[PDB]
Amino acid sequence: GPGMGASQDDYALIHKNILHSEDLLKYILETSVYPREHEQLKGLREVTEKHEWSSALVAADEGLFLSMLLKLMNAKRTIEIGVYTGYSLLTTALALPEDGKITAIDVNKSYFEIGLPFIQKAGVEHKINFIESEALPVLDQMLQEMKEEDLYDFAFVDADKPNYANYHERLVKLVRVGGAIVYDNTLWYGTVAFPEYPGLHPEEEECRVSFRNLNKLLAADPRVEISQVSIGDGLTICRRLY
Amino acid sequence: GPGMGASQDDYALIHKNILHSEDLLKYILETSVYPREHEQLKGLREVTEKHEWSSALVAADEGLFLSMLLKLMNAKRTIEIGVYTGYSLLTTALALPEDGKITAIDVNKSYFEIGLPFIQKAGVEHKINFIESEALPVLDQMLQEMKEEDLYDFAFVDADKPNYANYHERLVKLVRVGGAIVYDNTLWYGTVAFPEYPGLHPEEEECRVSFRNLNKLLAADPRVEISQVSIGDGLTICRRLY
Ligand SMILES: Nc1ncnc2c1ncn2[C@@H]1O[C@H](CSCC[C@H](N)C(=O)O)[C@@H](O)[C@H]1O
Ligand SMILES: Nc1ncnc2c1ncn2[C@@H]1O[C@H](CSCC[C@H](N)C(=O)O)[C@@H](O)[C@H]1O
Numbered sequence: 001g002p003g004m005g006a007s008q009d010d011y012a013l014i015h016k017n018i019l020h021s022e023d024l025l026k027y028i029l030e031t032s033v034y035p036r037e038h039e040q041l042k043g044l045r046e047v048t049e050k051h052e053w054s055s056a057l058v059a060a061d062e063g064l065f066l067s068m069l070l071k072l073m074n075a076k077r078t079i080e081i082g083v084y085t086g087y088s089l090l091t092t093a094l095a096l097p098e099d100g101k102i103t104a105i106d107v108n109k110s111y112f113e114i115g116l117p118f119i120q121k122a123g124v125e126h127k128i129n130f131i132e133s134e135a136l137p138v139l140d141q142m143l144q145e146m147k148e149e150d151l152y153d154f155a156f157v158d159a160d161k162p163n164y165a166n167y168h169e170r171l172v173k174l175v176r177v178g179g180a181i182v183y184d185n186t187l188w189y190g191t192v193a194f195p196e197y198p199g200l201h202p203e204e205e206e207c208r209v210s211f212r213n214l215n216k217l218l219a220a221d222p223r224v225e226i227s228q229v230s231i232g233d234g235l236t237i238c239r240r241l242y
Numbered sequence: 243g244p245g246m247g248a249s250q251d252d253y254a255l256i257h258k259n260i261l262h263s264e265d266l267l268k269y270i271l272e273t274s275v276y277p278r279e280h281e282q283l284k285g286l287r288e289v290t291e292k293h294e295w296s297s298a299l300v301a302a303d304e305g306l307f308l309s310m311l312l313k314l315m316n317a318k319r320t321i322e323i324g325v326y327t328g329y330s331l332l333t334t335a336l337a338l339p340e341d342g343k344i345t346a347i348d349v350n351k352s353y354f355e356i357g358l359p360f361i362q363k364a365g366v367e368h369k370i371n372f373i374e375s376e377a378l379p380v381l382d383q384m385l386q387e388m389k390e391e392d393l394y395d396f397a398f399v400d401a402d403k404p405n406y407a408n409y410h411e412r413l414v415k416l417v418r419v420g421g422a423i424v425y426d427n428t429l430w431y432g433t434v435a436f437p438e439y440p441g442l443h444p445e446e447e448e449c450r451v452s453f454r455n456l457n458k459l460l461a462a463d464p465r466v467e468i469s470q471v472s473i474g475d476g477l478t479i480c481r482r483l484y
């Protein structure tokens with residue numbers, strides 16, 4: 001629509017961190033992440049750092065954490081909403097068993113094709129079913145076709161932030177009981193801690209209010225148990241109770 | 243020497259945090275933690291906040307995360323090293339199924355008896371086997387007696403920080419394959435990011451050096467896969483590979 005530009009350069013928050021020490025974040029990456037990062041994940045991350053929407057790339061220390069959660073809960077079938085160049089997708093495919101299956105949804109296939117060569121070299125492309133679409137229609141169609149035996153073990157939500165609450169209503173019905181839903185960026189550069197935050201691009205302000213709404217909603221939702229973790233840009237782990 | 247003894251008043255790092263601001267940490271606790279905190283946990287926390295070593299009390303948001311970790315991996319047998327007043331121990335007991343069993347080890351039972359009224363009121367004292375002892379002799383005796391049927395699903399290490407590497411050699415054999423070992427305070431107030439750090443208490447400087455060595459050791463240990471998480475004072479999750 002007509003109006004102002006919504007490029008990455010038009011944002012204000014991209015360089016802000018939720019950790020107060022830039023030396024600490026680099027320590028975590030250099031000490032505990034990069035030595036454990038897959039060769040193809042390193043290649044995908046380095047090309048993505050050059051991309052015009054590099055700020056959306058999931059943090060590498062969060063990637064190792066998502067892989068740990070997948071292995072500890074022995075997830076076999078997952079769904080990812082918001083693929084971009086596919087770092088968390090490749091992280092998920094490497095963590096799942098050899099017969100693991102992933103449904104990856106993103107409106108932009110061109111982003112996915114940048115990281116697909118690294119996904120192929122890692123030899124886990126067969127686990128991924130990419131759907132070039134808006135997520136909400138795909139989710140709604142799934143609820144009409146999904147049976148209880150094929151419910152997802154794990155869901156990673158990382159697409160358009162203001163739509164998280166809408167995705168939530170479908171995903172607690174598409175994720176198995178005891179499964180996990182992980183919402184990315186639920187701390188939104190730390191701006192969620194304030195009733196008002198000046199200097200924001202209108203889209204960043206929308207997610208500040210939408211995440212402040214979502215965090216209250218998730219803390220009051222009886223269908224799930226939650227855990228908000230201050231890793232990366234913040235994330236909220238949801239475990240379905242019924 | 244003789245006197246009033248050791249106080250956390252003599253430590254330099256008690257008022258530090260890894261997050262960007264105190265407001266961000268306060269937002270997480272009030273939005274995402276306190277409405278999800280068991281009443282007996284809040285009672286245990288509020289008494290412990292007035293104790294003379296309240297700086298060692300595990301963070302409340304980290305507690306909910308350990309609970310989520312125990313539930314997603316369906317842990318049944320766990321072991322805790324360092325109980326203090328028992329906030330993480332209570333968080334563990336409430337997360338495990340009704341037939342869950344915990345081996346809790348601490349040198350000080352007087353700290354544990356501060357929290358045992360809350361554990362009993364929660365109705366989960368039957369899951370706990372407290373052992374007042376130094377942890378290393380107990381673990382060593384476990385390795386001569388334990389069989390494969392008694393291996394632990396989960397281990398939480400939160401005791402004397404310089405002994406973590408020694409605990410690691412025992413716990414990679416006491417935790418089952420695919421089980422989790424979680425080491426607390428592996429970021430040590432952010433001091434691990436620096437090769438030198440001024441004005442630390444000798445014990446505080448002792449743990450900065452030991453944690454910089456342990457973080458390098460865990461990242462190179464081929465027996466486990468790791469994930470360092472910037473929650474609370476930083477923790478490292480280790481999943482046993484073989
Ligand atoms: N309505 C929508 N439905 C599905 N995907 C959407 C969407 N709106 C935006 N997206 C996609 O969601 C992505 C968010 S960036 C996600 C980053 C990725 N998960 C990683 O690990 O790095 C963008 O690529 C964008 O194309
Ligand atoms: N060598 C040792 N062996 C076993 N426990 C020890 C120990 N040295 C110290 N400890 C215990 O480890 C505890 C560390 S404080 C632990 C905090 C607690 N886990 C929580 O959830 O808040 C102290 O209470 C101390 O009594």
Ligand SMILES: [Mg+2]
Pocket residue numbers: 056057058158184185
């Ligand atoms: Mg994200």
Ligand SMILES: [Mg+2]
Pocket residue numbers: 298299300400426427
């Ligand atoms: Mg601790």
